[PDB]
Design an enzyme around this catalytic site. Structure first.
Site, PDB file in Angstrom:
ATOM      1  CB  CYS A   1      -0.907   0.092   1.228  1.00 58.56           C
ATOM      2  SG  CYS A   1      -0.059  -0.231   2.801  1.00 58.56           S
TER       3      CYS A   1
ATOM      4  CG  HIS B   1       0.039   1.626   8.267  1.00 58.62           C
ATOM      5  ND1 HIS B   1      -1.155   1.060   8.671  1.00 58.62           N
ATOM      6  CD2 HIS B   1       0.326   1.074   7.078  1.00 58.62           C
ATOM      7  CE1 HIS B   1      -1.562   0.198   7.751  1.00 58.62           C
ATOM      8  NE2 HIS B   1      -0.680   0.192   6.771  1.00 58.62           N
TER       9      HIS B   1
END
Ligand SMILES: NC(=O)c1ccc[n+]([C@@H]2O[C@H](COP(=O)([O-])OP(=O)(O)OC[C@H]3O[C@@H](n4cnc5c(N)ncnc54)[C@H](O)[C@@H]3O)[C@@H](O)[C@H]2O)c1
Ligand SMILES: NC(=O)c1ccc[n+]([C@@H]2O[C@H](COP(=O)([O-])OP(=O)(O)OC[C@H]3O[C@@H](n4cnc5c(N)ncnc54)[C@H](O)[C@@H]3O)[C@@H](O)[C@H]2O)c1
Ligand SMILES: NC(=O)c1ccc[n+]([C@@H]2O[C@H](COP(=O)([O-])OP(=O)(O)OC[C@H]3O[C@@H](n4cnc5c(N)ncnc54)[C@H](O)[C@@H]3O)[C@@H](O)[C@H]2O)c1
Ligand SMILES: NC(=O)c1ccc[n+]([C@@H]2O[C@H](COP(=O)([O-])OP(=O)(O)OC[C@H]3O[C@@H](n4cnc5c(N)ncnc54)[C@H](O)[C@@H]3O)[C@@H](O)[C@H]2O)c1
Lengths: 341, 341, 341, 341
Positions: free
Chosen positions: C162, C189
């Protein structure tokens, strides 16, 4: 169209307006104004963007006609032009000019019969207090139980708290069928906006403590408020709320003594039938293994977990989730759609 | 020398070892071995640094005598040389040579008599299963209540759950003072190490859900267990557990029907007295508006919230906190100290 | 039309399948099979109910046949018959019978050429690894950048992480436009599925810590991946990651040295032009004061926050959001669709 | 004996008092008064019980003497008799009567030169502002850097912020050894008292969002403040902050261009050296894989993570933790104690 005004654009104020648009059926009234102590740019931003409920699926356009600030909103093939105000004191609101028939009082700050009436002193015909009543009231309504018991002479209605609206039907339904001697209520509730991020001075020494890191037991207006709806339950019911660190959704855990025989099967089957008949509009039952986050944005006043029902001798427990923001905001809408027919 | 070993250096196993060093009094036994399926450095690191109870106040240094691994742990004017092992299969463990008098099963995976005997086949003389009983056990002990009725002939013994260690004292004390017709328990528990961080496959579809963002009503081993310890209370009591996203600490809401006159005061007064007289090294009571994190590192089996007590007719509700990790871990040392007496 | 299979039905795999139905663009291929190590019942519940992205607006019906287990999923006016399998050894999967043109490896366990070929043995024509390469790949691909450089002879691809999907376009755009001497990355994150609920044994002693209660610095696959995609940048860009207790959505802080004249305007203006022209596909820009929740369920690879853009001297810093589950899942479909016509 | 007073008994105010008692070395000065707009009972409870830092290890007793409220506090073999007040307007406080040599200003409101002077014109001799300077000050001090530069003529002094006190040493220590062309800061910070619990109207629209559920980029007084401390850094540094859902402890990520050859080893040796020699009291360095909650209660102004240093080219990055409440609270005491002789 009846003309509606929201005083206080908080979690409730704002989700009312969202619910107006998001509903599957068009409500036969319009929201024509909102007041808050914040500016329009803030109000519009928090309206559009929501940590709890998502991005708003539609467009908001601020226009300034005269001095009057207006939001042009559109969503779900529906439009509204709303006037934005910034008046701290309700007596000084322009309810008369705008011709407001009902005011959803959603500030927390105006629960008295005296403060309520200030909106009437400002031109409004009726007021709905979006909270337990503080003192006197013309009526205390739980949509789906006593919404038909509103007289037209009633100016200061209360819609009580969310908690009250899950609690009352459980008690109504069960008292009616099996008889409740006494009952006790544990509410397990998401953090609310009144709590503290960190340990900070607060009226409540419980709600002073860091919201995100604690289990916080505390009081519930629900019980005092439920007794204005059903006075017979005075001295027969009590309970409290627990705050934990989730963002939204709550559960009510109600323990009661039945006056007739009772089984898990019988209790569950009662509540199901009610969900399908008299309480279709506001109640639902589930046998599925769900958790809090699954009931976010659910319009029901209560969803009963039938797996969680327990009976021992004459004592029983039931359990029900509600989205404390969405459910309650839809009940404010449903209640206004009742006054006209 | 009484020689103890810990199988499973988990939340419980690591907190047992710390508690040895942190206790006011020095225990008249020594921890001499630990086993985990993880490597030594991982165990040392987690032992030293804890997200919940903080850094270990002491020194830990690894030495490799023979082809064996030892930990040299100095703290609170105390020293232990603990051998470290890494054997998934409990019967292959050297409990014979090390002369383990008692093994503390803290894995979670070996709760049947069948499975727990594998320690006895390893040379261990007694096994405390740090968990509820799966099938059968020679005894089921809540220290402070029935620790005395352990026999010399007994080999597989259960310290039950932490929930059980808090629930029994309450029920014992109230059934004895007033009579419990029936009761029901709501336990509001912090997250536990078995749950899931995000939505992930899991044998229980409820604990499968994201631990940090959810209220998760689940089941409690604590009631089956209490029926073992108090058989006369069979069918008088039931309950369930809710998980919520705090790191540590739990509470019990006990809701009972009383067989004689009860008042809030007389309940609270019985508990205070009982704490002061019969149940002092395992039970306290507080008068103050506290929240979960005020009980982090509390050694008590339960602290009663005096403010949270409620009575309506013959029904009543009492409320107690406990540190699920630390509370229980002290009762494991406390229990072991009762055999050498 | 092409036949797709998903090995590993977790955060990615499950959002892959949803994005297929939710996509306003219908895709030209079909997903015909999935595999995990859990039973269909668990798999369906989790697909239907999600703490991050909500309930599925569709119907899932299980069809058990003589041996085969299928799912009939209907949503957004589309329908799919999906065979469900439970094989931990990818070599044994019936990819031949089912005629799987592409497999998506969303398991995180099969990242080598070795292991990804195990699908090719079972009959699959091509594998995409939903992770950074481990050893060798026939290509490493970021959709919107090098998606056109996929030779039809390429059998084992990687769709990186990602984080890589976002970093690469940022660097490509800036290095082309201004010239990057060196760059350094900070990723913040949300928590991931591999982390621990409480402090528990783990490979990484940092990700062993309680996800909910900790800032956790850690490594990033993304830098190795970026060198495979843009090989001229070897040694010009390093970085690392930080896990914080949100449920979803990450951000990326890129700090770089420029080889030519940079100003805040000039950077933002170029980033805007890309979001509009070359990368309107996968890239967006906002001036508004947003937070992590606002990018939940955004399908963009990166949303730049232009207000956070900063310059002093030759050094500058830019900021991008992304939905780490939903963006990454959309890029897989986007990718599979590019192998056509 | 110097006499100190605290204005604003918040997360800093309370932690300042606590840290007086917890210190290894008694301070050759005494805290004699506190002022908050809250009831004494609230202030005492909140001091005694703390989500972030524990129960206070000691006894607080309230006495009401000559219509004056006092706190008798005993701990670490020390006693303080502290007068409690409740004056919102600082000009009205009795600082003259109590002979206050230094006010600590921890309310957050009185940061302008003119505001802080209200304490001076109310009788106090010196004032430390516990935040970045708002407009101007007589001096901005970071204990361990410029603490010896205070003059007798400097009556309004700024102790800057948590952030600045970590940043200034880092910037200074490195600029001196290697040269810093430019630098850019990223601060990852726990939730602060000023944030909102649910999306609620707020001056800042990023800090209006729910604290427990979002990553929230924002601004940092730390650079304005560091420019006041190191005028030569004007135009040579910048940065920003990020709130994340943890309760306490922050980290600082610093990226700079060196003007001299750098490697990882050489950076860590310089910081270890500085921790051992001149910055020994305020700075420390760890080589271990640790996370936020490990630095809770650490008194250091900063702790470099030796493992986190990276270098590519002339550009490098260093990472340091700090307990944002406890660290700063000690530096206020340390700075008060530097006014002797
Ligand atoms: N939150 C729930 O789930 C829930 C459920 C049932 C009932 N209620 C009740 O609804 C009420 C509103 O709570 P909320 O969740 O919207 O919280 P909130 O604090 O977000 O909403 C209060 C709003 O009123 C505004 N405001 C404050 N003073 C004002 C004034 N003088 N004039 C106009 N606006 C003013 C605030 O800026 C804010 O927008 C409370 O009484 C609450 O107890 C809430
Ligand atoms: N945590 C609590 O609050 C609590 C309270 C009361 C009882 N318990 C019980 O204690 C037990 C341990 O729970 P926990 O919270 O410590 O969980 P945990 O996961 O932290 O502890 C389990 C430990 O066992 C280790 N292990 C796994 N397989 C093993 C094997 N084959 N041999 C040896 N060690 C092995 C794991 O690596 C881990 O260290 C459970 O059975 C639980 O029911 C827990
Ligand atoms: N979540 C993110 O933000 C993100 C983004 C990009 C890439 N990734 C990568 O995607 C992969 C999947 O991660 P995730 O976030 O979906 O986690 P996850 O744990 O939810 O996904 C793993 C899934 O695979 C299943 N599985 C386990 N063993 C299996 C086997 N032998 N065969 C088949 N299925 C098996 C698990 O039961 C689970 O459902 C990893 O490579 C991860 O690092 C994750
Ligand atoms: N907490 C940190 O990490 C940190 C670090 C460095 C600097 N600071 C600074 O410290 C200041 C205070 O922050 P805090 O963490 O103590 O927050 P806080 O909200 O806990 O502090 C405010 C306190 O002051 C009281 N107060 C408010 N108005 C008052 C008045 N007029 N007179 C007297 N008391 C009044 C409040 O009731 C409360 O007890 C801020 O300027 C902040 O930047 C905080």
């Amino acid at each position: 169209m009846q003309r509606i005004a929201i005083n206080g654009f908080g979690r409730i104020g704002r989700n009312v307006l969202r619910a107006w648009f998001e509903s599957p059926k068009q409500f036969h009234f319009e929201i024509v104004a909102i007041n808050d102590i914040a500016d329009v740019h803030t109000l519009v931003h928090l309206f559009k963007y929501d940590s709890t409920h998502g991005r708003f699926n539609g467009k908001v356009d601020i226009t300034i006609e005269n001095e009057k600030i207006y939001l042009n909103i559109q969503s779900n093939q529906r439009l509204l032009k709303v006037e934005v105000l910034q008046q701290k004191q309700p007596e000084l609101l322009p309810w008369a000019s705008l011709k407001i028939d009902v005011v959803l009082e959603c500030t927390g700050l105006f629960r008295s019969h005296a403060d309520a009436t200030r909106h009437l002193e400002a031109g409004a015909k009726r007021v709905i207090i979006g909270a337990a009543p503080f003192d006197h009231v013309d009526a205390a309504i739980v949509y789906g139980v006593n919404h038909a018991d509103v007289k037209a002479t009633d100016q200061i209605i209360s819609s009580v708290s969310c908690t009250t609206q899950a609690l009352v039907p459980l008690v109504k339904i069960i008292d009616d069928a099996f008889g409740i001697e006494t009952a006790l209520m544990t509410e397990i509730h998401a953090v609310t906006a009144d709590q503290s991020v960190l340990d900070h001075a607060h009226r409540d020494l419980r709600r002073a403590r860091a919201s995100g890191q604690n289990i916080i037991p505390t009081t519930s207006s629900a019980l005092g408020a439920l007794k204005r709806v059903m006075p017979k339950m005075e001295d027969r019911i009590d309970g409290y709320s627990i705050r934990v660190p989730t963002i939204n959704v709550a559960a009510i855990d109600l323990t009661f003594i039945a006056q007739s025989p009772i089984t898990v099967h019988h209790i569950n089957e009662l509540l199901i039938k009610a969900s399908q008949t008299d309480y279709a509009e506001i109640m639902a039952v589930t046998d599925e293994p769900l958790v809090s986050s699954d009931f976010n944005h659910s319009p029901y006043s209560l969803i009963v977990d039938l797996t969680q029902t327990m009976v021992v001798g004459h004592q029983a427990k039931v359990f029900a989730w509600y989205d404390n923001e969405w459910g309650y905001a839809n009940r404010l809408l449903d209640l206004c759609d009742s006054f006209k027919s």
